[PDB]
Design a protein around this ligand. Structure first.
Ligand code: PBM
Ligand code: PBM
Ligand code: PBM
Ligand code: PBM
Ligand code: PBM
Lengths: 182, 182, 182
């Protein structure tokens, strides 16, 4: 297996890999163009996002936006994200329809072994993140690697999501807990 | 009743109202000027803040700063904010005298219904935020919509404030709780 | 004691002090140059950090990076920090070998008295931060003033650290608590 295939599949990979280095530069180029583009530039922004992401249809994303690869982000219909959102997509980040991200939401997929020896060994690895339909994620929340958020979930601002979230609940806190059922 | 008066009053409003859209454009223009202002350009900075806010006297605000409208921000005397502070002022954000915001403090006022049908309906709404005199808000705190913070309050770094905070306490945590009486 | 000596030693100091002011200005110049440097400007980035920090050997720091003075930052071998990290170094921030900071980690040393009269009095003070060897700090964590983090610690994303952390543990939450032993 290619290092890219290993990375996407959530296995140990090498980021210094040639293809991956090139992929990150391509994404950086597109991100940079996205972020310095004007808001009146709809065709350009839409064109850049179609190029960047694995899947996208309607998407309103305020700069500044950031991702690592782009092709690991899969966004359902009518996606909305306020400024300073970060989607670090070492592994697939799959988001359903009608998602709303408030400002400064961070979604991570990269991780490291907790054991220091292993960590300092160059080991690189990620875990996918999946988010359902009609999910609202409040300002400055953090969604950790390997998390699955169900449909119709409201994530309060500043929440740090470390475990799966079932359908139809409001979560909040660090660590995030169920606040109430919808 | 114009959409603007509805917005400010904390009622359902339509952001696409032409007057509100002109208003956000003006704010972005002013914010952009502020953020790219060289350092010794203190006059320019002061004049921009006088033009942007609903009320301001002495105010030291390190770029980058961000707000939505500007005119819903009312700042008391001797206001101070470190870099990357954000005041999303769909509704009034009233802050008393001698306020100190550390870096990356976010104050929000916009909200959404928790019900997904209602949320996906295009319903736009906010709640005011009021902060007292002599309040010190630590790095990366989040102040949520509808919250009132009393006088002489210390908000610990990273705190996420979801409810009123009475006078003379230190609060911290997410959710933020009383840590000690002053 | 020059105000500088007081600042560094964690005593009440006056920031408006000319050398300090010059020192902060110098730091801003270097940071600015670092932050706008293109990637392949290896030589330059490394040269700038050598000039900025009190101690550094191998350090990979993704822009944007930010500090107050630079000379209060002491970094051990093989230092790594992702983008948006902030080290506000009014007092010494001493970090061991093989440290890894995920994006948007904030380390603070400045503080203010909790008493309002004393706070509004112009009182300026800091507390040193010390971090051990082989520490991995997750995305958007906050390390507060006066904290000491032992060796082989993993600080979970979004954790807010307010008290010392002993060797060989994973901490997480706000406030951060021991999640498990390593
Ligand atoms: C089509 Pb392959 C498992 C580098
Ligand atoms: C228009 Pb909503 C990301 C507070
Ligand atoms: C210079 Pb004080 C708002 C951490
Ligand atoms: C050798 Pb002195 C405490 C400016
Ligand atoms: C691939 Pb690590 C510096 C969150």
């Amino acid at each position: 297996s290619t290092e890219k295939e290993k990375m996407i599949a959530g296995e140990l990979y090498r980021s210094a890999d040639e293809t991956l280095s090139r992929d990150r530069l391509r994404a950086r180029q597109l991100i940079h163009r996205y972020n310095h583009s004007l808001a009146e530039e709809h065709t350009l922004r839409q064109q850049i996002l179609a190029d960047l992401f694995g899947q996208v249809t309607e998407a309103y994303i305020e700069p500044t936006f950031r991702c690592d690869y782009g092709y690991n982000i899969f966004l359902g219909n009518n996606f909305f994200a306020n400024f300073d959102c970060v989607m670090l997509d070492v592994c697939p980040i799959r988001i359903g329809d009608n998602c709303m991200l408030a400002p400064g939401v961070h979604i991570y997929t990269a991780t490291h072994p907790i054991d220091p020896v292993a960590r300092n060994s160059g080991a690189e690895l990620g875990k996918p993140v999946t988010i359902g339909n009609n999910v609202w994620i409040g300002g400055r929340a953090v969604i950790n690697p390997g998390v699955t958020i169900g449909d119709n979930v409201v994530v309060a601002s500043g929440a740090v999501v470390t475990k799966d979230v079932p359908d139809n609940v409001v979560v909040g806190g660090n660590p995030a807990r169920i606040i109430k059922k919808l």
